[PDB]
Amino acid sequence: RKGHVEQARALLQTASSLAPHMYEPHFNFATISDKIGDLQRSYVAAQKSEAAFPDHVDTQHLIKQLRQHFAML
Amino acid sequence: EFPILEKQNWLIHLHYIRKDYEACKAVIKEQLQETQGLCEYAIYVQALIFRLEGNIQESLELFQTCAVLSPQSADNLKQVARSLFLLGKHKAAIEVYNEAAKLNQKDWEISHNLGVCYIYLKQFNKAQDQLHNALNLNRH
Amino acid sequence: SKWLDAHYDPMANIHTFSACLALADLHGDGEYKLVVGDLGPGGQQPRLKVLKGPLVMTESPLPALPAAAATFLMEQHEPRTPALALASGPCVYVYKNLRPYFKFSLPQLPPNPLEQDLWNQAKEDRIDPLTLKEMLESIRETAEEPLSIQSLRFLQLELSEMEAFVNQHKSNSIKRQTVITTMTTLKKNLADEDAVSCLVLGTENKELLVLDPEAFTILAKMSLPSVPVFLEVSGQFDVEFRLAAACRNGNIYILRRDSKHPKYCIELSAQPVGLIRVHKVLVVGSTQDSLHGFTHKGKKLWTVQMPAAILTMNLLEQHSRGLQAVMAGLANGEVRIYRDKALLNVIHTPDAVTSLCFGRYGREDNTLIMTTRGGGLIIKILKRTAVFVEGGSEVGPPPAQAMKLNVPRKTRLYVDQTLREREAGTAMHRAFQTDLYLLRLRAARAYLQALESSLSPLSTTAREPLKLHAVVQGLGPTFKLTLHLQNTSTTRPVLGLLVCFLYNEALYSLPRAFFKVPLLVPGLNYPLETFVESLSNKGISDIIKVLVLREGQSAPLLSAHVNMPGS
């Protein structure tokens, strides 16, 4: 909310490694690392936000947002 | 005859266009082992399968091998810089697009990917004309 | 608007494509005999198969993996059926009543003369290993013109083999073949079927050959900048000739009558899976399942989306009704049929279909043959009474009552609570503030109680966090403690810090106890492991500090690790 992007992206990086369940850091990684543009780590982020909690809405609007970028333009 | 017939790419392109990625990986392993090595299209579509799965770090070094076997081709030096647009390294990619922008002119998407990679930077004014350059050649 | 199930044979083994099936009369009679270039169930040897009735008629081995199948006329000599053509490798094998003859050869385009200087220097025992390997690097790197089907293995050979092949590698007379990809039929000299047919061949050298009946020399030659895999022709000759071809680069290329250059180019977003024309419009199939349509010159007309992955496309042609429709063999098993913008019918029954034709089979005039993905067969037969309708209902968005305004119900236990808030609420507001005013003080007096002691695992000046954990192998008297450092800069590597952990002396040792931390790169996380050696069963918390190099002993990021009670 303030702007400290690199500070935030390390706390979610260590929130995930403490809880290898609980989808909420995994999905929240893939809306920081998607706005920057790193669509490779922002896939494996939003990969675990499907396996740890399926039937999420805003994960299924994000994997299909990424899989259009991966095929072609 | 002895050496290789060396061209069976019409079949592998039928597998990839059918999204049968499990049978296509066999023929890629088949044709590359049938030749002594360094087949071209068996390397290329194997890199285009790993780019469909998320293994973009593995779909960049295979496009480096495909950037060696034909350096006068404007495909791979364009297709490498797509695999660098996705790994986040934006400014490294805008020169490889320029590297393919000089080996071939009047191309549509190379003057378009340079547009969208500037907007993920903060340079905006020299992005707005790039899409204008990308619209007049081909509307999309 | 229905069909008739002729047979259903899911035990066969027919692995093929829609490009290598054809319907013609192999014995000259009225019986149309289906012919299939069977590849192999596990990529096996290519075996030719022909069909008579619901079972096969003759099998035959093939020299290589076949590409396509067409049937071609000679002149007015006999009124027999067009003779079958079979493209396989760089040698098409024509078949006229099962007669293997005329192995046709490709023109075998010769290499570029800069390679011919390497061809002409070592054959007179003037061979050197080093300067041959550098003269080839001046050929391929400045301007290629490589023809590297054989020239690449004419150059990649190393010191040991080439000096052992000083006579052999120069006796290898290069043939320079090029493999055919696809094959189609064009009515020669006129648009009528009574005239002879004229072959069109595209091949791996991004060139479009065109052959002649009964002589088979060359008729002309076309130039395309990309390798073609799907092509068709409108079919006229001597006044106008439109040759359309799709390529591996995801483009649509069309050709004029005698101008041997792509006059008009139109593109898609992805690879077209099939190129079929209609009477005047031309449709494609994208692998993003967006079946387009383009006119004679080629512009955007209409687009139908398909709810599954396209796998086969073909042309429907009824001689009686005159209906020109386009097939679409989908991935789940259905076969959707389309006119310009209308779904005609579907057939939901079998599994995934790879091969599809629609013509007359034998005596019956309406046959639409399909093929399972496993290799079996399934045959449909149209009846004379059925004409194809839309016959489509009005499928709406939401006709289901699955969720009718899901709202929870507020009982009596809430509606009495709003009366307590309505009259005595003014005392409740001042009760919140003066209890929250102690809360800001109690937090900040406990915040600054640890910030000055720097207990927090976060920092701002030297910008790393510190996470730490007890690992699974750390159990019992032995105990292992990992530690995780990682910089949060982009380009500022922090340099040579110190990690030391003061701790109240229990009966464990931790023999190093004072490290020098490596140079932290921006981005990677560092595992740092120790070895607690506890002797008996206790539990007491450690405090692990990290310091700046020499001056500041203020100890940022000291993490009071709480230990587990070991045995």
UniProtKB/TrEMBL annotation, chain A:
<feature type="repeat" description="TPR">
    <location>
        <begin position="1"/>
        <end position="22"/>
    </location>
</feature>
<comment type="subunit">
    <text>Part of BBSome complex, that contains BBS1, BBS2, BBS4, BBS5, BBS7, BBS8/TTC8, BBS9 and BBIP10. Interacts with PCM1. Interacts with CCDC28B. Interacts with PKD1.</text>
</comment>
<comment type="function">
    <text>The BBSome complex is thought to function as a coat complex required for sorting of specific membrane proteins to the primary cilia. The BBSome complex is required for ciliogenesis but is dispensable for centriolar satellite function. This ciliogenic function is mediated in part by the Rab8 GDP/GTP exchange factor, which localizes to the basal body and contacts the BBSome. Rab8(GTP) enters the primary cilium and promotes extension of the ciliary membrane.</text>
</comment>
<protein>
    <recommendedName>
        <fullName>Tetratricopeptide repeat protein 8</fullName>
    </recommendedName>
</protein>
